Amino acid sequence: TTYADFIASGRTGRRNAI
Amino acid sequence: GHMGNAAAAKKGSEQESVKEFLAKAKEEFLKKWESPSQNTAQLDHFDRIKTLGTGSFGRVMLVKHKETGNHYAMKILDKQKVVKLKQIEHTLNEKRILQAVNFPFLVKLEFSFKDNSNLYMVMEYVPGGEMFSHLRRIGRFSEPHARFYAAQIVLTFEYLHSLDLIYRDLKPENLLIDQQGYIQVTDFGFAKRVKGRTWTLCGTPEYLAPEIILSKGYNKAVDWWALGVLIYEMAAGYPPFFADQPIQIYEKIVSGKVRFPSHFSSDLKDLLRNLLQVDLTKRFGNLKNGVNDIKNHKWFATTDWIAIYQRKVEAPFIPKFKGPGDTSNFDDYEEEEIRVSINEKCGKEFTEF
Numbered sequence: 531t532t533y534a535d536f537i538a539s540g541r542t543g544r545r546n547a548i
Numbered sequence: 549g550h551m552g553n554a555a556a557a558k559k560g561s562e563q564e565s566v567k568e569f570l571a572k573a574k575e576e577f578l579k580k581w582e583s584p585s586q587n588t589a590q591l592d593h594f595d596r597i598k599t600l601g602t603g604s605f606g607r608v609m610l611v612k613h614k615e616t617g618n619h620y621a622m623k624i625l626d627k628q629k630v631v632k633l634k635q636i637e638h639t640l641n642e643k644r645i646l647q648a649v650n651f652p653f654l655v656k657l658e659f660s661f662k663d664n665s666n667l668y669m670v671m672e673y674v675p676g677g678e679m680f681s682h683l684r685r686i687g688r689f690s691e692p693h694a695r696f697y698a699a700q701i702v703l704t705f706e707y708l709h710s711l712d713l714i715y716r717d718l719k720p721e722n723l724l725i726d727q728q729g730y731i732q733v734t735d736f737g738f739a740k741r742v743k744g745r746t747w748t749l750c751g752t753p754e755y756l757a758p759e760i761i762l763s764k765g766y767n768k769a770v771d772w773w774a775l776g777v778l779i780y781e782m783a784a785g786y787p788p789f790f791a792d793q794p795i796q797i798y799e800k801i802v803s804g805k806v807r808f809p810s811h812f813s814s815d816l817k818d819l820l821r822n823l824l825q826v827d828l829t830k831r832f833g834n835l836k837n838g839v840n841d842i843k844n845h846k847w848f849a850t851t852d853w854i855a856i857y858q859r860k861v862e863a864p865f866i867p868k869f870k871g872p873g874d875t876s877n878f879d880d881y882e883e884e885e886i887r888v889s890i891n892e893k894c895g896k897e898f899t900e901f
């Protein structure tokens with residue numbers, strides 16, 4: 531599922547600005 | 549048409565009233581953006597309690613004012629690290645805008661000051677925690693729940709943009725939930741007064757509009773794109789463009805393709821296709837009709853805009869709060885000691901703060 535791919539990615543925590 | 553004579557008359561009158569409100573709002577703003585405040589307190593006035601959030605250049609801490617007993621949120625930025633990250637302009641923007649704006653969904657700045665090592669901005673403490681935390685915990689919000697929050701962002705952006713301000717860091721991490729269940733926008737690090745275009749590459753990768761990625765000058769339409777990302781993330785549980793490396797995120801953003809969960813309503817997908825619109829000349833919020841293309845979209849048909857602004861609407865939930873100094877709606881961060889150097893650091897860079 532897309533949600534599982536999301537939790538599996540490195541982008542679920544607080545996202546620093548660029 | 550879609551509206552009868554009654555609704556058409558009401559809506560037009562509502563639009564005139566918005567214009568009247570915004571003209572008054574701009575007048576009040578212009579005084580403070582010409583003559584800012586400075587040096588409103590000092591560090592020992594405050595007992596420091598716990599870290600509420602950490603960033604690359606400083607932290608925000610829960611503090612208690614000694615004479616008042618009131619709790620505040622104190623943002624502390626290390627002057628040398630700010631200089632080091634070429635964030636001087638942004639920091640001075642944040643302070644000067646925060647002291648000049650006034651809106652129910654914008655965090656209120658109480659004090660600001662500086663010492664040898666740090667800059668300090670003392671804000672009202674918003675106890676219910678970040679939308680980020682509630683969203684990740686619940687997974688996704690229902691559409692009525694997402695719509696309640698989105699409506700508050702639409703109104704906040706209408707206000708900010710009418711003041712020639714762009715926000716540029718919309719994301720759930722920056723949206724706090726207050727005691728009544730309403731949103732407080734915090735962190736104006738990238739907010740800026742802009743009358744034409746601006747050019748800095750800044751923001752958060754998942755929320756960057758295509759024109760930022762393609763290195764063009766851009767304007768307030770990036771905030772409306774970012775609202776499209778926010779509503780998607782709130783309703784889906786994940787943002788529309790993600791990948792482990794920012795460069796893959798950027799590639800998806802500019803392709804002009806977005807896929808939707810099958811539980812999204814058709815009304816929601818139609819709004820999002822118009823916000824997540826790569827073509828600047830077609831993006832909702834950027835057309836001849838301005839924010840009214842958003843406020844009058846079918847997905848917001850049940851939204852009472854004035855009632856939201858007046859905070860008359862019952863919220864989807866009220867955060868649990870067991871006392872005025874309760875931080876249970878916030879994560880735990882490692883505490884570090886605040887050291888104030890014997891020597892003044894970067895004194896000239898921050899003369900305006």
Ligand SMILES: Nc1nccc2cccnc12
Pocket residue numbers: 600601608621655671672673674675724734735
């Ligand atoms: N004004 C605030 N209240 C509570 C928590 C906060 C976290 C980061 C920034 N501002 C905050």
